[PDB]
Amino acid sequence: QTKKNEIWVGIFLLAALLAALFVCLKATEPTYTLYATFDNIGGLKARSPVSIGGVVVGRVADITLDPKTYLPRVTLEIEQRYNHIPDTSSLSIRTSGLLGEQYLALNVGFEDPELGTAILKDGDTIQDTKSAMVLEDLIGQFLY
Amino acid sequence: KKNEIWVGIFLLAALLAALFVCEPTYTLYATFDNIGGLKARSPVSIGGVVVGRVADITLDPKTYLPRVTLEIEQRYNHIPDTSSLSIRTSGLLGEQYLALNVGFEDPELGTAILKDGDTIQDTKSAMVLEDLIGQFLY
Amino acid sequence: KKNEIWVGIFLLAALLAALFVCLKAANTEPTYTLYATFDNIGGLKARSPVSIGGVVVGRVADITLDPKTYLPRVTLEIEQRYNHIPDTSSLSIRTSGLLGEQYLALNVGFEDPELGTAILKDGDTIQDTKSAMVLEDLIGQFLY
Amino acid sequence: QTKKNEIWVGIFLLAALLAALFVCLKAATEPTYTLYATFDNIGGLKARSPVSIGGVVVGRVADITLDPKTYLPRVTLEIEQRYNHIPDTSSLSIRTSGLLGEQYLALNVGFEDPGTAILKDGDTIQDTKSAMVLEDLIGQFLY
Amino acid sequence: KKNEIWVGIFLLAALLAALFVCLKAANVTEPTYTLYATFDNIGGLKARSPVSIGGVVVGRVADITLDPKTYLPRVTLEIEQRYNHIPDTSSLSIRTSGLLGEQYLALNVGFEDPELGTAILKDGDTIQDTKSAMVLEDLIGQFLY
Amino acid sequence: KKNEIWVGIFLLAALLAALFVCLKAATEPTYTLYATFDNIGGLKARSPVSIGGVVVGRVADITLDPKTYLPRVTLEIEQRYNHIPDTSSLSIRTSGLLGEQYLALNVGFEDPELGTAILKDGDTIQDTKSAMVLEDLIGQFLY
Amino acid sequence: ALASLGHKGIKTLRTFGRAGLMLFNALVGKPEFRKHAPLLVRQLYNVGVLSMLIIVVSGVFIGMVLGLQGYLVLTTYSAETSLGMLVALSLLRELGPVVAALLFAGRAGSALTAEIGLMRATEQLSSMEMMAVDPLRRVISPRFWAGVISLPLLTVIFVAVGIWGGSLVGVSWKGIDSGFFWSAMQNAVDWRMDLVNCLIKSVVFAITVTWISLFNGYDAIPTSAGISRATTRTVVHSSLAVLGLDFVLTALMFG
Amino acid sequence: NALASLGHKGIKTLRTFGRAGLMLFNALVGKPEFRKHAPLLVRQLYNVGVLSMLIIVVSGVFIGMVLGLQGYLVLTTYSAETSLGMLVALSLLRELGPVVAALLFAGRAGSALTAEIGLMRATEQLSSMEMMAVDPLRRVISPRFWAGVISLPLLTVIFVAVGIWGGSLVGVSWKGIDSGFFWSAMQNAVDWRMDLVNCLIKSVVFAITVTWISLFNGYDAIPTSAGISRATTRTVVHSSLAVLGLDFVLTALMFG
C-alpha cells in the first residue's frame, strides 16, 4: 500500500509542477539600472516594460519624485545583453495600441564614437527624454 | 475554563490586528467651476505620481461653485503658492484625477509655501465634450 | 445570567459600533420640483442626476410629452439645501460615459441685484434649455 | 416545537417573495396601432427595438422583413394610441444610443398645413433615413 | 438484480439522448443555394459571419480559402433561396456592424435591368463586382500625407 | 470475470469512440523567412501572418540585431503557398484596439520579361514597412 | 485493467439503476401531497430555513467581490456606470444558481444524506416498513419536494442579496451615482428571459442535487463509517453534477 | 429572552474560538516536527491531496469552459474576442481559481478530515493513543494540518492550469479564435508575477483556514454517530463562509 501512496503522491507533485510550468510558460538575468527624469510620466507603474523598437529590453523598478525640484524619476533596469546604448538615445513614453498600458520607448540615438559620446553603463542617466501625452492639452492644442 | 476564554480573546484581538494592518497629510482647498467627474478619494498627482487623495466635494452654498478639499502627504512641503491645479483623465478613457502643477517661484519675489489650510487660487476646470465639439464645429 | 446578559448587551453595542465604523466609509432630504421642456432629451431617463458643475443636487422625477405639442417635458426635484437659484439659470443635457447615459447640467445664471432675478421656488419653470446633441446629424453637419 | 417551524417557513417564503419582488422591480398591454416604413439600411435594428419622439419611448418595433419583390427592408412598428395626432411630414430616422448603445428609431413629427393628413392604423410613413454605416462615412470624410 | 441493471441502462440511455439532442440544439432552414466571390482583403471576416441585404441577414459565409494561383482570398457564402432575383450587378462589400461590432458582408442588390436580361445568380454562380474591406493604417496614412 | 472484462473492453471502446466524436465536434511543412523592421510595435511571437485576411503562417521569434538594434522577426509561411514573389512587402497592421498586431504579407506581381526570385526557405524579404505608432501620428497631425 | 474496469462499469450501471428505481418508486402517487403538509413544512424548515443564513451571508460577500472586480475593470473604459448591469447579469446567469447549488449541496445536500443514513443505521426504515408504512412515500418524497421547492427560492434570495451587495460596493463605497447604476441595470439587461433562465437552471440543480443527496443517504452502508463515506460522496458528486449541468445549460441557453 | 440567549451564544463562541486556538497552538509546537514524520505526511498528502484531485481537474475543465462561453459572448460585441485568453486567465488567477478550489477542497477533503477525526475520537483511538504516552495533537493533528496546507495551493495551481486549457478549448478550438492571438495576448499583456503571487497567497490563506476549521470540528465533535454527521455539515458551512469572507477581505486589500 505504501508503495502506491508514495508513487501517487509523487505523481501529484509532478502534476502540480507541470501545471505551474504550463502557467509560467503561458504567462532572472543580469541587469544594470539607469535613471531618467520626466515632467509627466502619465500612467507608468512598477514593472512597465522598456522596449527598443518594440522588443522588451527590461522593466521599471520604481518611480519616485525628485524631493528637491518635484520631478518624477524612473529607475529602469535594462538587461545586460544590450550594452551598446549611446548617450544620444532618447526616451519617450507611449501606449500599446489605443487603450493598452503605457510603456517606455527607447529610441537608440545615432551612435558616434567619433565626437566623444560614450555608452550608457550602470548608474548613468539618460538626459534626453519626452513626457507622456495628456488628452486635455492635446485637444487644447488641436482646436486652438 | 478561564484560560480558554483568555486565549480566545487574545486570538480574536490578534486576528483583528492582522486584518487591519496585515500618514501626516495636510489639507488644501480649491474652488473649480466644473469638477467634471472627480469623486472622493480620487488621486492628486504631480507629474503622474500620487501625492494624496481628494477628501470630498461640496458645493459652496453661497455662490454654487464646487469647492474641492484635498489631502497632500507630508513628504511634499515646498509647494509654491503660485501653483496651479487641473483635472485630467488618466489615459484616454480612464478615471479623472487632479494634476497638480508645481508653478516655479521667483527668487526676488515672495512665493508663500502652501501651509496646512491654505487654498489654491489658480485652477482649471474639466472640459465638457459638448462645448468643445460646439467650438470646433462653429 | 447577569454577566451573560451583560456580555450579550456589550456584544450588541460592539456590533452597532462596528456598523457605525463601516458607515464612516460612506453613508432623506426635502425636495422641491421644477419643470423644463426640451426639444430632444436624448437618452435621459428617470433618476438621472441634476448636477451644478459636477456636484449632484437632484434627480429627474419622470419624463412625459406634451400630448398637444409633442415636446418632452422633464420634471426634476432639486434638494432643498440649494434655495437661491436665479430663474435665468439654463439647463443643458450632457453625455456621460459611452452607452448614452445622460444627465442634466444646471448652469446657474449669476444673480442680478439690479433687476430682481426670481428665485426658482417650488413648482416653477425653467425657460432656457438645450437639447442633447445627437451624434448622427452632428457628423452630418461636420461633413456637409 | 411546531409553530416555530410554521412561522419560520412563513418568514422564509415571505423573504423569498420580497427578494423576487426586488429583482422583478429592478428588472423593468396598451392599445397600439402599427405603421410601416421601408428604409434602405436598417443597420443594427431588431425586433422589440424602441421607437422614440424627442427621446421618449412611444412604442416598440414589431418586426423587420424584406420586401420579397424589391429587396428593401420594410420595418413595421407599433405606437401607443395616446400619441394620435402625428402628421405625415414625420420622418423616421435610425440612430444609435450614445456611441456604443443599441440602435433606436428616432421619430420626429413635422409641421402641418391649414395636404397634411394624420397617421392612422396601417398607414406607411414616406420620409425615412437609413442608418449611417461606418466605412462610407470614413470614405466621405477622407474624400 | 436484472431489473435494476435494465432500469440503469434505460435511464443512462435517456439521459445521454437528452444531452445529445441538447448539444445538437446548441452547436448549430436549408434552401441554402451557394455563391462565390473573390476579394482583395477580407479584413476580419470568418466562417459563420452573416451576409445581409440592406441590414437583415439572408445567409452566412461557408468558409474562406486562398486561390492558390493568385492569392486573392476567395470566399464562399450560402444564401437562403427565399431570395432569388439577385442580378449579377449586385455588389458585395464588407461593413462593420456598428462602430466596433463584428464584420459582415453587405449584399447591395444591383438594379435588375428590365430590358437587357441580367440573369439571376443561381446556385454555384459567382459575383463579379466586390469591394475589399478597408484598413485604417494606410487610410490614415494617405489622409494625413 | 472474463465476461466482465469483455463488457469493460466494450465500454472502453465506446468511450474512445465518443472521445473521437467529441474531438470531431470541436503540422504542415512550414518554411522559414526573415525580415527586419524599424519598429515592430506590439507584434509578439505566434502572431499570424495573413495574405489579405487569410492566415498563412505564424511568427516564430523576434530578436534585435545586437549590432544595429533593429528588430528581426523570423516567420514561418506554410508550404502550400510557394509562389510568393520577392517583390512582396510586409507591413504590420493593427486589429482591434489593445495592440493586437499581425503581419500582412502583400503579394507583389512578377515581371513579364525576367520573372522574380520566388521566395524560398531561408530567404529575406527586403521591402518592409514598420508598425504604425499613435503618438507620432498625433504629433504629425497637430503639426 | 479490464479485469476490474468491467466490474466497475456494471457496478456504476447498477448504481444508476438503483437511483432511478428509488426516484420512480418515491414519486409515483396520487394521495402524495395531502395529509403530508405537516411533513413537507417540517422538511422545508430543515432543508430551506436552516440553510438561509449561509445563503444570505455568502450572497453579500459574492456581490461585494463582484462589485470590486467589476469596478476595477470598468473604471479603465469609463463604464463604471454599467457595474449594475455587470453584477446583475453575472449573478442571474452563472454565479447565482451555481454558487447557490454548491452551498445547498454543502449545507442541505449533506444534511439530508447524513440524516437518512442515520435513520437507516438505527433501523428506523425497517421499523417503518414493519408497520406497513412505505418509507419511500413517507420519508423520501417529503424531503425531495422540500429540496425542489427550497433551492429555487434560496437562489432568488442569493441573487437579490448579491445585487444589494454590489450596490453597497459600487454606489456607496466607490461613489457611482445610484441613478445611473439602477437605471442602467434595469433597462439594459433584466429581461424576463434572464430571470426565467436563472429559475430554470436553479430548478434543474435542485432536482439533481436533492436526488443525489437522498440516494446517497438511502444507499449507504449503515455503519457509522459508511455514512461519512456517503456524505463526502454526496458533496463531491453533487458539485460535479452541478458544474457539468451548468456548462450544458449555458451552452444551451446562451448560444 | 434575547439578552440571555445572545450572551450565552457569545460566551459559547468565545469558548469555541479559545479551544480552537489552543488546539492549533499545542499541535504546532515541536522539535521532531518533520523528521520521523515522513510516512505520516506522505499518507496524509495521499488522503487529502491525491484523492481530492479528480474533482479539482474536472471542475477546472468545466469552469474554464463556462468562463470561455460567458467571456466570448461579452467580448464579441466589441470585437475584442482575442482578449478572451487574458479574460479567462485573470478571472481564474484572481477570484474563481482560489475560491472555487477552496470550496471544493473544503467539501471533498475538508469534510473527510472532520469525519475521519471524529470517528477516530468515537472509537476511543485518541484516548487509546494518549494512554500510551503518544500526544495525539502531535501525531494525528499536525500531519493532517501540514498535508492540507501543502496540498491546497498545489490543487489551486492544477485547477488554474486546467481551467485555462478549458477556456482555450472553448475559445480557440470551438469558437474559432486565432490561437496565436489568444495565447500571445494573454501571456504578454497580463500574467505577471503579481497576479500569480496573489493567487498563491490567498490560496495558502484559504488552506490554513479550511484545514484548521475542519481539524477542529473533527476534534471537538460529540463522539456519537449523530455528532459526527452534525460536525461535517458545520465544517462545510463554516469553511465556505470563512473562504468567502477572507476572499472579500483579501481582494479589497490586494486589488482595491
Indicate the DSSP class of residue F68.
T
- From the number of C-beta atoms within 10 Å of its C-beta (0-12, 13-18, 19+), residue F28 rates as exposed
Under a CB-based contact definition with an 8 Å cutoff, are residues G224 and G114 in contact? no
Tell me the C-alpha to C-alpha distance, in Å, between residue H155 and each of A24, E50, H67, H187, H236.
16, 43, 19, 22, 18
Under a CB-based contact definition with an 8 Å cutoff, are residues E66 and E99 in contact? no
Is F37's Cβ below 8 Å from some Cβ in A? yes
Under a CB-based contact definition with an 8 Å cutoff, are residues G97 and G253 in contact? no
Q: Are strands C93-95 and C102-105 parallel, antiparallel or unpaired?
A: antiparallel
Q: Which residues of G82-120 are buried (b: 16+ CB within 10 A; e: fewer)?
A: bbbbbbbbbbbbbbbbbbbbbbbbbbbbbbbbbbbbbbb
Please report residues of A whose CB lies closer than 8 A to that of B87.
136
Residue A62: beta bridge partners?
Answer: A75
Please report residues of G whose CB lies closer than 8 A to that of D23.
156, 159-160, 163, 190, 195
Nearest CA distance, D8 vs chain E (angstrom)? 37
Exp. method: cryo-EM
Residue of C nearest to D81 (CA): C67
Q: Across the B/H interface, how many CB contacts are shorter than 8 Å? A: 33
Gaps after residue numbers in chain D (C–N over 2.5 angstroms)? 28, 114
Three-state DSSP at H137 gives helix
Comparing C-alpha atoms, which of G116, G65, G109, G128 is closest to residue G221? G116
Q: Which chains reach chain D with 3 or more Cβ–Cβ distances below 8 angstroms?
A: C, E, G
Half-sphere exposure of F18 (CA within 13 A, CB side): 8
- DSSP H or E run through D32: strand D32-38
A95 φ, ψ to 5°?
-140, 135
E56/D75 Cα distance (integer angstroms): 11
Tell me the C-alpha to C-alpha distance, in Å, between residue H197 and each of A20, F41, H94.
12, 29, 10
Q: Which amino acid is at D104?
A: Y
Under a CB-based contact definition with an 8 Å cutoff, are residues F5 and G3 in contact? yes
Is G124's Cβ below 8 Å from some Cβ in H? no
F97/F42 Cα distance (integer angstroms): 12
Please report residues of G whose CB lies closer than 8 A to that of E99.
none
Residue of D nearest to C37 (CA): D54
Three-state DSSP at B22 gives coil
Nearest CA distance, E143 vs chain G (angstrom)? 28
Under a CB-based contact definition with an 8 Å cutoff, are residues B30 and B120 in contact? yes
Is B57's Cβ below 8 Å from some Cβ in A? no
Is E136's Cβ below 8 Å from some Cβ in H? no
Three-state DSSP at A93 gives strand
F140/G164 Cα distance (integer angstroms): 50
**Radius of gyration of chain H measured on its C-alpha atoms:** 21
C19/G109 Cα distance (integer angstroms): 33
Q: Which residues contact H235 (CB under 8 A, 6 or more apart)?
A: H106, H110, H111, H114, H213, H214, H217, H218
Please report residues of E whose CB lies closer than 8 A to that of H76.
102
Comparing C-alpha atoms, which of G182, G157, G183, G194 is closest to residue G60? G157
Three-state DSSP at F76 gives strand
Tell me the C-alpha to C-alpha distance, in Å, between residue B102 and each of B47, B71, B83, B113, E106.
9, 16, 5, 11, 55
Whether residues H22 and B7 touch (CB distance < 8 A) is answered with yes
- Region for D42 from its dihedrals, namely left if φ exceeds 0, alpha if ψ lies in -120 to 50, beta otherwise: alpha
- DSSP H or E run through E104: strand E103-108
For residue G149 the three cell numbers come to 421547492
B33/E41 Cα distance (integer angstroms): 50
Nearest CA distance, H92 vs chain G (angstrom)? 12
Under a CB-based contact definition with an 8 Å cutoff, are residues A41 and A65 in contact? no
For B92, the closest of A41, A99, A131 (CB atoms) is A99
For an interface test with C, which of G83, G180, G181 has the most C Cβ atoms less than 10 Å from its Cβ? Answer: G180
- DSSP H or E run through A75: strand A72-79
Residue D124: beta bridge partners?
Answer: D36
For an interface test with H, which of F22, F23, F47 has the most H Cβ atoms less than 10 Å from its Cβ? Answer: F47
For residue H191 the three cell numbers come to 500574467
Helix H84-91 vs helix H142-168: crossing angle, to nearest 10? 170
Indicate the DSSP class of residue G149.
H
Three-state DSSP at D78 gives strand
Half-sphere exposure of H157 (CA within 13 A, CB side): 24
Please report residues of D whose CB lies closer than 8 A to that of E106.
133
Under a CB-based contact definition with an 8 Å cutoff, are residues H168 and H89 in contact? no
Under a CB-based contact definition with an 8 Å cutoff, are residues G156 and G58 in contact? no
D11/E126 Cα distance (integer angstroms): 69
Q: For the residues of G67-80, what is the DSSP string, one character each? A: HHHHHHHHTTTT-G
**Radius of gyration of chain F measured on its C-alpha atoms:** 23
Under a CB-based contact definition with an 8 Å cutoff, are residues D22 and C10 in contact? no
Is E touching B (3+ C-beta pairs, cut-off 8 A)?
Answer: no
Whether residues H77 and E101 touch (CB distance < 8 A) is answered with yes
Tell me the C-alpha to C-alpha distance, in Å, between residue D55 and each of C63, C93, C133, D59, D95.
9, 12, 11, 12, 11
Q: Which residues contact D110 (CB under 8 A, 6 or more apart)?
A: D87, D88, D89, D90, D91, D116
Indicate the DSSP class of residue D46.
-
Tell me the C-alpha to C-alpha distance, in Å, between residue A2 and each of C113, F7, F61, H51, H195.
96, 31, 47, 15, 38
Q: Which residues contact E34 (CB under 8 A, 6 or more apart)?
A: E62, E76, E77, E78, E79, E123, E124
Comparing C-alpha atoms, which of G165, G245, G217, G251 is closest to residue G19? G217
Helices (H), G75-140: 83-90, 96-121, 124-130, 135
E101 φ, ψ to 5°?
-65, 180
F69 φ, ψ to 5°?
60, 35
Comparing C-alpha atoms, which of F88, F92, F51, F98 is closest to residue F73? F92
Whether residues D106 and C43 touch (CB distance < 8 A) is answered with no
H66/G90 Cα distance (integer angstroms): 12
For an interface test with F, which of H78, H178, H187 has the most F Cβ atoms less than 10 Å from its Cβ? Answer: H178
Q: What is the 3-state secondary structure (H, E, C) of C4-47?
A: HHHHHHHHHHHHHHHHHHHHCCCCCCCEEEEEEECCCCCCCCCC
Under a CB-based contact definition with an 8 Å cutoff, are residues E95 and E104 in contact? yes
Three-state DSSP at B55 gives strand
CA dihedral G117, G122, G126, G130 (to 10 degrees): -150
Task: For residue G131, count other CB atoms closer than 10 A to its CB.
Answer: 6
Tell me the C-alpha to C-alpha distance, in Å, between residue D63 and each of D34, D42, D45, D86.
11, 12, 9, 21
What's the first-to-final CA gap in chain C, in angstroms?
86
Residue C86: beta bridge partners?
Answer: C119
Binding-face residues of H in 53-82 toward G, CB within 8 A: 55, 58-59, 62-63, 65-66, 69-70, 73
**CA angle (G97 as vertex; G96, G99 as ends), nearest 5:** 70
For residue H85 the three cell numbers come to 485568453
Under a CB-based contact definition with an 8 Å cutoff, are residues E65 and F54 in contact? yes
Entry resolution (Å)? 3.0
Q: Which residues contact D1 (CB under 8 A, 6 or more apart)?
A: none
Three-state DSSP at D79 gives strand
Task: For residue D69, count other CB atoms closer than 10 A to its CB.
Answer: 7
Residue D107: beta bridge partners?
Answer: D53, D92
Tell me the C-alpha to C-alpha distance, in Å, between residue C139 and each of C142, C144, E101.
5, 8, 20
Q: Are strands B26-31 and B119-120 parallel, antiparallel or unpaired?
A: parallel
C56/C48 Cα distance (integer angstroms): 10
For residue D26 the three cell numbers come to 429592478
Tell me the C-alpha to C-alpha distance, in Å, between residue E73 and each of E35, E67, E139, F130, H140.
14, 6, 21, 24, 69
Task: For residue G231, count other CB atoms closer than 10 A to its CB.
Answer: 30
C16/C6 Cα distance (integer angstroms): 15
Is D1's Cβ below 8 Å from some Cβ in G? no
Whether residues C101 and G81 touch (CB distance < 8 A) is answered with yes
- DSSP H or E run through H200: helix H193-219
- From the number of C-beta atoms within 10 Å of its C-beta (0-12, 13-18, 19+), residue H146 rates as buried
For F138, the closest of A96, A108, A133 (CB atoms) is A133
For residue H202 the three cell numbers come to 490567498
Half-sphere exposure of A95 (CA within 13 A, CB side): 24
For an interface test with H, which of E27, E46, E60, E96 has the most H Cβ atoms less than 10 Å from its Cβ? Answer: E46
For residue G87 the three cell numbers come to 453584477
Residue D65: beta bridge partners?
Answer: D74
G25/D46 Cα distance (integer angstroms): 49
Q: Which amino acid is at F100?
A: E
Three-state DSSP at G45 gives helix
Tell me the C-alpha to C-alpha distance, in Å, between residue G242 and each of G104, G204, G246.
11, 9, 6
Q: Which amino acid is at F39?
A: N
D37 φ, ψ to 5°?
-160, 140
Is B48's Cβ below 8 Å from some Cβ in A? yes
Q: Where are the beta strands (DSSP E) in E23-90?
A: 33-38, 51-53, 56-66, 73-79
Nearest CA distance, A96 vs chain H (angstrom)? 10
- Residue identified by cell 447579469 is G89
Q: Which residues contact H173 (CB under 8 A, 6 or more apart)?
A: F26
Look at chain D and count its residues. Answer: 143
Residue of F nearest to E144 (CA): F141
For G68, the closest of H66, H119, H252 (CB atoms) is H252
Comparing C-alpha atoms, which of D48, D103, D46, D44 is closest to residue D78? D48
H176/H170 Cα distance (integer angstroms): 9
G229/H130 Cα distance (integer angstroms): 27
G16/E12 Cα distance (integer angstroms): 7
Task: For residue H51, count other CB atoms closer than 10 A to its CB.
Answer: 17
Q: Which residues contact H211 (CB under 8 A, 6 or more apart)?
A: H110, H113, H144, H145, H147, H148, H149, H152
Whether residues E47 and H78 touch (CB distance < 8 A) is answered with no
Q: Determine the number of helices (DSSP H) and then strands (DSSP E) in chain A.
A: 2, 7
Under a CB-based contact definition with an 8 Å cutoff, are residues E34 and E76 in contact? yes
Whether residues F98 and H183 touch (CB distance < 8 A) is answered with no
Whether residues A63 and B49 touch (CB distance < 8 A) is answered with yes
D7/A133 Cα distance (integer angstroms): 65
Task: For residue C13, count other CB atoms closer than 10 A to its CB.
Answer: 10
For an interface test with H, which of B1, B3, B11 has the most H Cβ atoms less than 10 Å from its Cβ? Answer: B11
